[PDB]
Amino acid sequence: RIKETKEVYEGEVTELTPEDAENPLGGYGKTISHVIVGLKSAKGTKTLRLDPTIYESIQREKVSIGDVIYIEANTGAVKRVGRSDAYATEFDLETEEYVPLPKGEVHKKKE
Amino acid sequence: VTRTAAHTHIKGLGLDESGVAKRVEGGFVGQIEAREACGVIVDLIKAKKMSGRAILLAGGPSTGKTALALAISQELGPKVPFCPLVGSELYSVEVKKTETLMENFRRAIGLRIKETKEVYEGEVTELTPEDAENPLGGYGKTISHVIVGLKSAKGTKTLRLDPTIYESIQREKVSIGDVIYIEANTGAVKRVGRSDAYATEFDLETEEYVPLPKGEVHKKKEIVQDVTLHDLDVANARPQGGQDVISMMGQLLKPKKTEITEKLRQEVNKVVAKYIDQGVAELIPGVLFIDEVNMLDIEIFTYLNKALESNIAPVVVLASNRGMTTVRGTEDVISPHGVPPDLIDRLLIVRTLPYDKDEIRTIIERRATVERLQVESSALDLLATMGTETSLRYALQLLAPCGILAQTSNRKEIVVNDVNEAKLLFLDAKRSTKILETSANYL
Amino acid sequence: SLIAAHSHITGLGLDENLQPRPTSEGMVGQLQARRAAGVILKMVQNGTIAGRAVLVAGPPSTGKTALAMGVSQSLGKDVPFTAIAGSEIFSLELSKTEALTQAFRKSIGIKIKEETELIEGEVVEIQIDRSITGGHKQGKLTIKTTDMETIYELGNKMIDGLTKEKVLAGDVISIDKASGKITKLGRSFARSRDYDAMGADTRFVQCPEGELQKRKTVVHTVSLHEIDVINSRTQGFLALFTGDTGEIRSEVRDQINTKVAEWKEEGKAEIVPGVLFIDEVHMLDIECFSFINRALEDEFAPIVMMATNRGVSKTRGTNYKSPHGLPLDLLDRSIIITTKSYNEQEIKTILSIRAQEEEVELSSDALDLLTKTGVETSLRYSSNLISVAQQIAMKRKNNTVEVEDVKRAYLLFLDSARSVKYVQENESQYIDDQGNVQISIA
Amino acid sequence: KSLSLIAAHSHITGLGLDENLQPRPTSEGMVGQLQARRAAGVILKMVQNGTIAGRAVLVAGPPSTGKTALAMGVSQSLGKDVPFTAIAGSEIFSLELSKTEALTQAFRKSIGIKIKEETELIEGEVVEIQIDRSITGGHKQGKLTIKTTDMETIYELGNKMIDGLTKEKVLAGDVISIDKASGKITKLGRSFARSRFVQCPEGELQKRKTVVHTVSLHEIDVINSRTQGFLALFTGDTGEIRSEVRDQINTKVAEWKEEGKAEIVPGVLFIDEVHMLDIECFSFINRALEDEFAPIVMMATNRGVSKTRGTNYKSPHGLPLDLLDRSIIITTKSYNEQEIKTILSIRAQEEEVELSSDALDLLTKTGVETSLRYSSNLISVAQQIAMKRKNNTVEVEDVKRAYLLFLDSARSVKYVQENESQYIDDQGNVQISIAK
Amino acid sequence: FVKPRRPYNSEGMTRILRRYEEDLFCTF
Amino acid sequence: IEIDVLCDLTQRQAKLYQVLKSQISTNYDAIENAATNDNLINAVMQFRKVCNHPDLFERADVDSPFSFTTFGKTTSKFTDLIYSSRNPIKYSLPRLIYEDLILPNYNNDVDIANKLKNVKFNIFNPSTNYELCLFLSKLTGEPSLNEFFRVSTTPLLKRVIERTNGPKNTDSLSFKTITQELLEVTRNAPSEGVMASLLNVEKHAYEREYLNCIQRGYHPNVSAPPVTIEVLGSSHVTNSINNELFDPLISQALSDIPAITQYNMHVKKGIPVEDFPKTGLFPEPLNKNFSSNISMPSMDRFITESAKLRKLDELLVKLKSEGHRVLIYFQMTKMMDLMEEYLTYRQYNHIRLDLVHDWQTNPEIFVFLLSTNLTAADTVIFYDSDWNPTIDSQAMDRATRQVTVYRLLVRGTIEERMRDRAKQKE
Ligand SMILES: Nc1ncnc2c1ncn2[C@@H]1O[C@H](COP(=O)(O)OP(=O)(O)O)[C@@H](O)[C@H]1O
Ligand SMILES: Nc1ncnc2c1ncn2[C@@H]1O[C@H](COP(=O)(O)OP(=O)(O)O)[C@@H](O)[C@H]1O
Ligand SMILES: Nc1ncnc2c1ncn2[C@@H]1O[C@H](COP(=O)(O)OP(=O)(O)O)[C@@H](O)[C@H]1O
């Protein structure tokens, strides 16, 4: 048996921004200074200013506005749970299952 | 300083010019007729014209058959192959026993080849790919040509490779500024290391640094090589070395011994015969030593009497320790040396004879000098009496513990007290058997 | 970790003149066997004689495995000691000769000397450049100290070691060139940028002083079998752990023998011979004994330590019956250390040492009762009863184990002979050798 | 011939038979066994007729009477382009294949299909190769001057020939053979322009040829069995070929024979020491000869009334009764003094330099006394000790020296019998020590 | 004279840049 | 001052000694004083060239497997290559076999039976067998119901390559076992982690046992391509085996696209990043020395492979203050290899055949190699091959005022035999 602590940020993304930078090097499509993401949970809402290296994980995992995600602090790797329950907008046909909006605060330190 | 492996005292057969045996030469004591017969066999090997000649070194324990086999190997030289074996080797859980036997047979036969290889090597100054026209189509490669700049002393050439060569080039992680080595025979390439023209004191990958290669590029180098026939068989059966996907995938898999078909062996023999007649190959037939041949069963002997009668099969030598015993794998055939009467007609028996007290004493003396421990004369005589009384082997193995007890006693001399303490601490087979007999605890 | 049957033996209990002390290093008794085992230990420590078979003989519960494990304890670290049993050879993927050869190659060790380089400093700037797919990587790392600053290039392995356990500018790391290890000692600059993702900030360390590049030489030990399997296939490093290595050809064996002798003569390698210990060697087969008697005659063969508890018994795979179960040709190669049964004082010392290692406060009369039980039945039974009696004393809330706990433990748990008599008394209740039983009371 | 050293059966170049199958007393390296040799000639004419399917012959007799010599003589007199498979009894006990599968593969290796194919080939010497490699795009052009003793011509080369000539780099003067259909050039060598060498090719460039192809049914079975490629023919992991692809190949072969674009060539399968097969193998052989595509099986055994493996009863020749019913038996006899003298004469003539006549008589006496094979093995070592004495011929005293050194079976058995405690017996008892 | 540093061909690549004050990422 | 050092025979020198000592009947000719007496002379120079050093009489070339190939060779503004290695074994097939068994034909039934056994009667066909497909869709949670038909009709390597990262349905019976959750929870994990460090012992054993700097110990002896199949008179066989040996998906999967090319499709041609043909799946070798079987000849192996050059470089490491000379008649005028040795690695100020005046102005440039009144050198290393001390004394007569003697010897060789007779003559 092993005990530990899990410092995670969980919620529903309302806005993610690949924020640009002054002096954008040269001959480059973008120059991301940081990524701001806005998480929403049950009775909780946070804006997280992340390192730029989470952007390619976000872009690979198809993370867009209207999804429930679950990240880790020290690793900084995004894991997309799915879309939020309320945003079943394409009511005719859908494939991705709609997870309920996650309980608890946006910042959890579980053991 | 140097480790002794119970046979380091043996350097050769110790024969003279006319085939007679000197009494002391090469660490051999006695066994004159056996040494002369083994020298005749060595001469027969150096004749290099026979196939499937077999001898059996009959005799008891502590006699010197294994010593005679390694004496044959020492006299023959490391150029001609020698494949030692034990009879329990022939039982494999992955392939048939008979195929293990023929694999050892073609391990014994050697080859001497001299091959010229086209070689490209030099420092990579330029490395620029050419993009393909339709990349997402996927039925061609993503590139079409790669232009490579190679520079060395006295010559400089630019290299427009096929993509399949650039596969190996990228697989060795070739960057700009390292000395590389393209072997044009198989398409393999070896990245030697980063060139020392630039600074070499700022990397973090403990790379080796090499000067510019001498001579031009397109060096045609002739090298000489020694390979066995079995190694050709195992290279052609499991084809690693090409730059096709069959070979690249065959590198990654775990190899299993497979039943090598006869057709591959005839094709390899035809290719080797073309190499013989073309003039770069010279056949070196060898010697295969099956020790403990009593452990082989009837199936190996039955296949062996047919496998010895082929045109290419080497000279095999055999050792047996037992007398009039039943053959393994059968329950009615009672036969000498554990060898069936069908095989014994092909076989030339070489007898070996047991030892006297003086021979045992001289063997103990030479084994003590090889193990770099000097002995006293009365202790040597005592050890000779024990060697006659218990066995030669027990007197041999007891030499190191009395030496250990001598260094314990702060002296370099072996006395009879050390021999008596070696008697008291360690026991031979006979005293142990009597101790088992008197005790009732099933000790 | 845990207390086992051989927890108490720390050494061979031997003086510098190869004479055993009466009671030292967690050992007692067997004075001649201890002296002979020390002689074999000094033979291994000299390490210039190869393939000396040593056989231990005796009744069960005499101290054969205790003798061998004491040899292993006093043998010292970084010298190999295989402890195989007889039954482990018979495999479905290896041959028995192949399994013996692999045990032989495991038992012999190589002390590779390697020259390395250590850098330690404050990280200035990272310039990792990756391709679009991320497969190919190249970078520039910049690192300083209080004295001087250097710009280094980067490769694939160093960049991927910087990515995992992620390093920012402001950290103090240490890199070993020969092994490629990355050790982030902590964060020194304490930069004003604090991203909300980072929650694990390493402890503050003073930034180091002096020169970055420090020369260092280290030695690491790798056995012959590990080099053999590493050179065997493309992915050989996995086969150490999964054990999917098998039927390895003789070509890699002879080539590695030549290469090992090469590394020996240029001074890179210093071979230390080891010990292979085969407990219950009477379990083996006749083909295995054939390969054993022909396998000790090489330079790369260790001292082989063998154990038996059989009398004149049948050699396996064969009709005949041989001393110790071992055939005569192998018995002639071996030299036999003998062991003899104990008496009341030695058994008393054994249980006293065990109960000291079992943290049990035993009373003296209970100790006398345990000695009488051990002489009466077996040493192992009186060894086993101590922990049970301790638990029974714990249930009655007394620390000192008394005589009534010993009697209750003796009544609750049965030894060999009493169980034999209880089976013989009412044999109809148990299933017979002919498969006959009566399961009803009427 | 490939690489061939001197072996036991190397002198046998076939059956020494005339046109009326009457055996000459000594011909083609083989002497004696005239009734057996006439029987082997009749069986050879059966195989050369090729209209008889699935007969079994049993070459039974005493050891060292020439049964394997008879089979090697049949194989040599058969020549090439007729398949011959010589297996032993210990081969078919496979760790991956079943016994009947290995027997089926050995049965189908000795049945062959002969196909005549006419191809296209251009072979000459390159006078000069030019390429106008002004590659504005991917297109390139060039011309080739190719010469023989009666041809001299220039060719206009397309792009694929330029690709095929860039690799396998042909210079001027090299000799190349071009296959126009597949675009594979082979560099046979360089002509006589020294100022490996090969002769300049003769005239008539672009000459069609017929290359007669003979493949066995086992290779067609391996190819048609779809998950195993032709690499199974070398690696040996064919792995239990199914019966349905065998039936398909048999129907296709019958179709090819009927429509006349393939000819079937029967062969001989030889099983040396057939007494080691199990009773299951005897049952599969017992029912395997009734197929039309079954070769002429040769079996050789040298056992008396012995047990059959896998059972516990005894049977004649080491074979069960129904298999003896389904085979005709060729008998062989032992050799008298003159046959031993002739055999030793032939083997010593081929193997080494000549012998003195009294030494040859001593060899014949030893061969009568002990064994033919022992004397034939004494020949070479007597010659080697003669070279160690530095004499050309082999005298009597060299034979005496070799007789003193290398024992036969009888002296070894006797000397084992007087020295019993020195050796290890069945019960593992041995007196290693020499004192008391 | 001290040998020049090895050429650093990084064309055709994204760039991770981490500095003392702030961390960048140049992509395509 | 006279000193003598004796040396042990190295491994390659001893094996060369044995292989050229065997012959047929040498009768130990060089130590039978054949060099003292006056073919015997050929054995004498062979034993001398072996007993000194191997590379003084044949070059230690590269260590490579024997190329069992029939590649396009030559007789000897860019020179181009096409990979053309083939096995010498040519398995020839008739055209009837291919054109009547493998390829479809109007009288053949290959394609009809192939479709009839792989599509019409495949049990994963949703057109005929719906409920079985829906059964497995409930089990494995597959999003698409044709996936079972796709898996059942795809080769294993190809099915391995196009590995899908899409997560399954969440109502499935695929219950992820605790080992998979353990592996996925540490997929990108830092150090100092309790579940992190438990699940990687191979990287700990790698870093602890210094496997990043180990050397290659084994190379294969023969390497070969797959055996070529040669069907005469058809281009379909050529296309088929060229496609199977060089399938662009499999070859490209074991590959890597160059970086500027990835620029070209991702930016210039606008190809999306996930539509790249996937690369980088070839397994990484254990070390840089394990990448290729070709072994380069090492300078350090030249230094360490000699009985006398090892102690010689040890001696010039120790000797700095005195310029020294070598009697090069230990190998009969072999200046070349020692020249390459000490301007390749042990570089010093040097002079070898105005010449005699250069080493007396300063001792920083040693006198070094000369073949034997110039005693102004500080010392001279005259060591062995002297079965007569007359040439020894005449060499030391030529030679500051102080003379120092450095003697070298190898035990077990002919130097013990000529240098025990000449020792009593001195
Ligand atoms: N002729 C001999 N001269 C010297 N030592 C010998 C001789 N024959 C055997 N020995 C020694 O006896 C031991 C047994 O040799 P070996 O041939 O391996 O076993 P065996 O003689 O039982 O076949 C070896 O250690 C060897 O050193
Ligand atoms: N001299 C000794 N010193 C310490 N413990 C011993 C000694 N002799 C025997 N023992 C104990 O006796 C038990 C039996 O010894 P061991 O060799 O392990 O089994 P066996 O004697 O049955 O082979 C072991 O638990 C060991 O602790
Ligand atoms: N009729 C013969 N002519 C020539 N050589 C023979 C003859 N019979 C036997 N031999 C030779 O005798 C040797 C052993 O005979 P072998 O073929 O083993 O007899 P068998 O087949 O009966 O065992 C072989 O080398 C063979 O060449």
XYZ file of C-alpha atoms in Angstrom, chain B residues 17 46 74-79 115 117-118 120 129 131 133 135-136 138-139 141-142 157-162 164-167 170-172 181 183-186 189-190 192 205-207 214 218 220-223 225 227 231-232 235-236 239-246 249 252 263 267 271 275, chain F residues 15 18-19 22-25 27 61-62 64-69 71-74 76-83 85 88-89 91 157 221-227 244-252 254-258 260-261 264-265 269 271 277 282-283 288 291-294 296 340 344:
142
model
C 60.169 -35.174 -35.798
C 46.868 -31.249 -42.003
C 46.955 -27.001 -29.651
C 49.023 -28.842 -32.261
C 46.630 -27.991 -35.087
C 46.595 -24.257 -34.454
C 43.811 -21.697 -34.053
C 43.433 -21.234 -37.834
C 36.965 -10.094 -50.231
C 34.630 -4.073 -50.546
C 33.736 -0.757 -52.158
C 32.805 5.445 -49.200
C 17.447 16.288 -49.276
C 11.504 16.691 -51.635
C 6.429 15.663 -55.820
C 4.213 13.458 -50.536
C 0.795 12.508 -49.147
C 2.283 7.352 -49.749
C 2.994 4.930 -52.610
C 8.845 7.822 -50.424
C 8.708 11.381 -49.104
C 33.093 13.996 -53.969
C 29.369 14.747 -53.907
C 27.011 11.847 -53.426
C 23.486 11.537 -54.867
C 22.025 8.595 -52.992
C 18.875 6.551 -53.472
C 16.995 3.415 -49.410
C 20.584 4.397 -48.605
C 19.323 7.522 -46.838
C 17.223 5.208 -44.652
C 19.165 8.689 -40.958
C 19.121 5.513 -38.857
C 22.699 6.130 -37.769
C 31.654 5.143 -43.537
C 29.939 0.141 -47.135
C 28.610 -0.244 -50.661
C 28.531 -4.057 -50.531
C 25.411 -4.287 -48.361
C 26.810 2.633 -42.947
C 28.777 3.255 -39.748
C 32.525 6.822 -36.787
C 27.292 12.769 -25.352
C 30.880 11.454 -24.732
C 31.411 11.149 -28.474
C 43.349 9.209 -45.261
C 35.761 5.342 -53.247
C 38.367 -0.310 -52.678
C 39.736 -2.293 -49.737
C 40.545 -6.008 -49.741
C 40.161 -7.718 -46.363
C 38.296 -13.227 -43.214
C 34.228 -17.927 -41.372
C 27.695 -19.270 -40.087
C 26.904 -19.002 -43.797
C 23.074 -16.022 -42.218
C 21.166 -17.295 -45.240
C 18.589 -12.984 -43.552
C 19.880 -10.044 -41.548
C 22.095 -7.553 -43.358
C 20.076 -6.272 -46.309
C 18.342 -2.909 -46.438
C 14.936 -4.349 -47.340
C 12.096 -4.558 -44.843
C 12.565 -8.329 -44.519
C 12.409 -6.678 -39.518
C 14.391 -7.026 -34.441
C 18.666 -27.350 -50.145
C 23.250 -23.864 -52.504
C 28.489 -20.807 -53.958
C 34.536 -19.115 -54.643
C 47.495 -16.277 -31.455
C 50.492 -20.118 -32.654
C 48.875 -19.997 -36.114
C 51.895 -24.682 -36.414
C 52.702 -24.920 -40.193
C 53.267 -28.634 -40.989
C 56.562 -29.451 -39.209
C 60.429 -28.084 -35.354
C 41.715 -3.459 -41.349
C 38.078 -2.830 -40.448
C 32.923 -6.143 -40.664
C 30.635 -9.106 -41.300
C 31.348 -10.966 -44.511
C 29.139 -9.447 -47.185
C 27.344 -12.373 -48.827
C 26.314 -10.224 -51.783
C 26.370 -6.006 -55.646
C 27.346 -3.764 -58.529
C 31.112 -3.345 -58.338
C 33.596 -1.514 -60.547
C 38.282 1.405 -60.865
C 29.365 16.154 -61.214
C 28.123 13.647 -58.638
C 28.386 9.873 -58.436
C 25.042 8.274 -57.605
C 24.063 5.029 -55.881
C 21.191 2.606 -56.127
C 20.999 -0.160 -53.539
C 22.709 -5.992 -53.018
C 24.240 -15.167 -54.824
C 21.644 -17.927 -54.412
C 16.022 -19.587 -56.881
C 2.399 -5.410 -39.574
C 30.390 -13.093 -39.193
C 28.196 -13.266 -42.298
C 25.412 -10.858 -43.202
C 23.181 -11.509 -46.182
C 20.115 -10.133 -47.931
C 17.025 -12.290 -48.399
C 17.502 -14.910 -51.080
C 7.340 -6.577 -51.048
C 10.996 -5.894 -50.274
C 10.411 -2.121 -50.247
C 6.813 -1.484 -49.195
C 6.657 2.311 -48.733
C 4.381 2.174 -45.700
C 6.599 -0.352 -43.917
C 9.817 1.289 -45.125
C 8.517 4.740 -44.217
C 10.916 2.334 -40.069
C 12.155 5.737 -41.216
C 12.182 9.441 -40.493
C 11.182 12.345 -42.727
C 13.844 15.102 -42.855
C 13.060 20.706 -43.889
C 10.785 18.286 -45.730
C 7.724 21.773 -46.830
C 4.518 19.752 -46.446
C 2.292 22.365 -49.232
C -0.453 19.180 -45.444
C 3.026 9.056 -43.007
C 12.366 1.651 -35.540
C 13.614 0.519 -32.108
C 26.025 4.389 -30.315
C 24.072 0.841 -34.006
C 26.057 -0.918 -36.733
C 28.062 -4.114 -36.972
C 31.060 -2.441 -38.627
C 36.491 0.808 -37.007
C 52.207 6.850 -37.850
C 48.872 10.193 -34.796
